[PDB]
């Protein structure tokens, strides 16, 4: 039932939501560290030992 | 008993009724979807499942 003029608006919403989950993960930071932009290991020194 | 001048008028009525059932099915629509013009399946997503 949904027309193609409906699917244009639903696609406009879907691309805006996906641009938003690209933005909020692309530029978010704790102390200048992009948490979700790239994959890496953060190592925590939790002890006096090496 | 009916004369042929009668059958001309009855045929005029019958062709007008058939033009009307051609029109009201040719151009009727819910959200830009011609329901009776062509034969096809409308699938309803009635569940979260695919």
From TrEMBL, chains A, B:
It comes from the Bacteria. It is found in: Secreted; Bacterial flagellum. Transmembrane segments: none annotated. Flagellin is the subunit protein which polymerizes to form the filaments of bacterial flagella. Belongs to the bacterial flagellin family. This is Flagellin. It comes from Salmonella typhimurium. The gene is fljB.
């Amino acid at each position: 039932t949904n027309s193609q003029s409906d699917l244009d608006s639903i696609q406009a919403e879907i691309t805006q939501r996906l641009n938003e989950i690209d933005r909020v993960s692309g530029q978010t930071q704790f102390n200048g560290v992009k948490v979700l932009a790239q994959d890496n290991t953060l190592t925590i020194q939790v002890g006096a030992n090496d």
